[PDB]
């Protein structure tokens, strides 16, 4: 069949069309997201940004399993994207968590196909999630989760006022 | 309910969802089409970077309907998004129809919104649609054209060589 | 006996000195292709200036070994250098058939030792494999894949015609 | 407990802690050989450089494992320093000596926590092993050797000239 | 013995190889008050980099000890340094009044070797802590104080908004 | 046969095939001396990089033969290339005495060959030979007969003092 394919299992093959398909909806989540924090009754403009930029860091992803699954000979197979979770997104601090517990379900599916590789004795495949993927989202993760703890200590007795000042001090706009 | 909202219809507000869903199909369709001719035993570069850049133009199609929604005080909703209709898209010449076939389905509902638009009095839309899609939409289809009419004469006894001299001498690499 | 080495076996010493003969014999061969294409009844300038730069990559491959032998404090040894398969190329089609083939040998020689490597614990040459070679070989052996394809569009009823065009047209002159 | 941490260990976390330990206790070790160097009656000033520079070394290793620890979500714990094994280095030759053994035990010491890693299937702790310590280690013990072999051809019958030698024309002064 | 040692009493030197572990102790305390700040369930920048710049400056008084021990002719020896007082440090306010605690401690011990200086009539080592110290430390002083004066004044009756406008409007970011 | 060849013996032509792998021969003998020379118990820099310049040089004198073969209408045939006569060089002198034999074997090559095409009456060939090989070679075996006198000079009664001071004072590091 393939004139390129070269120590590159049918397992792995479709694990990195799913992983796309669980990218390509993290990424929409996020266009959700920021479109829910641009409302005129939600107005929170650095919420906005924080999470419209992170539409854009998923897609990347997507874009580069794309990429490698054509430099390793497998064919990309997209499948229906299924809509976000929830329509409406709560405070920002409902969707900080939101998005934190999105990151660990995309950390979990990049462990497990760098398992797979490991078993299927494929060293490009792990090499490629350890130097793009793993490292980035520890990273992303460690930033949420120093949000989170920022948010919740504002809270106190004046949400309202916490969040305006999260949104303004810490995030950019 | 909205403190902005000013002359938007729910039938208005409904359509422009609608339609983000259409443009986000058509620039799923476009990634598919561009991941396609990137592959190393269809190996079209012109090709690829052509509907790559589609992807991201219908893309942003639909982040400004979706900044429209909310300048005018409706909510964005987001509903599943089909997976494309081909896994395969064939030769240049069909994914050329397949895409002229695709940007007249997206005029006809860019159409259809605008003649809402104007039956329920709404300026502001109309005008919207006038600036940023309708000219857009009629330039992209003039530029297909003219490619599947080159395409079209190369096709020759010689297949090969005038898809190969088509993507070398008329698309970008 | 060595000051410095650590962690570093007989076995993968004696594999890496074999991994050098494999690609001081791979940039023999691409000198030998290289010089094919430049003679006055073959005259591709193109597909001369391809191969001839693939000879200075895979020397300077050989030359990675070799300092990493040195730096883990096992000792390089050379043995004969085998000439080329072929005095003469054919076609540019039967020289980048060879070529892929050459390139799959020299990618599952570097599996065969990174295997090594993983059984040995020895995460140092692993890394060493991962960071240098393995993606330096998928992207080229992807890259010969696309050649393959245009290559084989142009053959059609003419191939003359099709083997100048492609040199002309895609390789760099 | 932790907000942010997956798949990181308690084995991992506590040997991380212990390496922390033995990299700032390597860091004090070249404080002190700097400063036996810098001696009026020792006075070898690029030998004094060389140690002085490795004691930033091996610091900034201790600061990249705690900024890890806390990106996986594990608690940095610190605990006593012992004090170098010397008060007194002897000649440039003992020290350098002295040096190489340093190296190999924390050399040692990340292949141990590697192979931990790996046995708790941590990709992300081995990838930050592999990126930002093997190589520079390995890197610094092939210097360390070249540097002890120059040493060792100088003593001939004059020690003291050959120390002098070493430290005009080969360290940094 | 010392070509050089000149009215450099036996007291001195002991007591300047003392103040030397009490500045590495501190220096210690404040690489862990810097990574408590860090963790991602605290997650105070502003205190982070307060603390970690602080880190730095007691290694330099160190060093600068340490260098003037050998310029006098006395010998730097080294001994264990215990590790901080504490694992976990609380809230801003209590870090920074462990903090002022800290400096108050290396502050005397200062005067009290400034008045051995003076008793063994070494002008050199009083001048030398004049010029380099004791200013150094009382303007750190006088700035934790003002720190915990604004620390205490945001307490009011919501500590953890307080806690986050004093590193976001007082420290560095 | 040969559209081009005009004045071009096979004498010449098969003699040009074997000067290359002369040449060949002794680039490869080249790039074991300097590997030899950056060994961690060897640790001569200025040696190993004087003998990797000299790889360079005679690979470029090959590469001219080459060019020249095609220039004339030639074919420009490869053999087996023997390893190195050494895998280890012994002391610079050592090797500085094999590198003038190997410079005086090539030059030896030359003038037969310079000879064979003055037999023939080829001016080209033996205006070629003056022009890129005879005084290159003439230059190098003057140079290294000089490092050879100095070397000689520095052997005395300390053989290792000597060695380093020519790797520093004369050679490039
Ligand atoms: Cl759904
Ligand atoms: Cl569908
Ligand atoms: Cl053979
Ligand atoms: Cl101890
Ligand atoms: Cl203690
Ligand atoms: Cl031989």
Redesign the interface.
């Known amino acids: 069949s ?3 394919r ?2 590159y299992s049918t397992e792995v093959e479709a694990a990195v069309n799913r992983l796309v398909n669980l990218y390509l909806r993290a990424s ?1 989540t996020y ?2 997201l920021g ?2 924090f ?4 939600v107005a929170l403009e650095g919420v906005c940004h924080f999470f419209y930029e992170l539409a854009y860091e998923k897609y990347e992803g997507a874009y580069r399993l ?2 490698m ?5 497998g ?10 979770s929830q ?1 409406e997104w709560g405070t920002t601090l409902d969707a900080m968590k939101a998005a ?1 517990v999105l990151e ?1 379900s995309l ?2 599916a990049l ?1 497990d196909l ?2 797979l590789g ?1 078993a299927q ?1 494929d ?2 495949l ?6 793009h993927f ?2 980035e989202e ?2 992303l ?2 930033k ?7 948010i ?7 949400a309202g ?2 969040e305006y ?2 949104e303004r ?2 995030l950019k706009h």
Do not use: W
Request: hydrophobic share 35%.
């Open positions: 393939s004139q390129i070269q120590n929409y266009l959700s479109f829910y641009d409302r005129d009754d794309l990429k699954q054509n430099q390793r000979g064919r990309a197979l997209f499948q229906d994207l299924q809509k976000p329509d934190i660990k950390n979990q462990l760098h398992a490991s004795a060293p490009h792990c090499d490629f999630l350890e130097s793993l490292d520890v990273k993760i460690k949420m989760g120093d949000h989170l703890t920022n919740q200590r504002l809270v106190g007795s004046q006022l916490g000042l999260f001090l810490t």
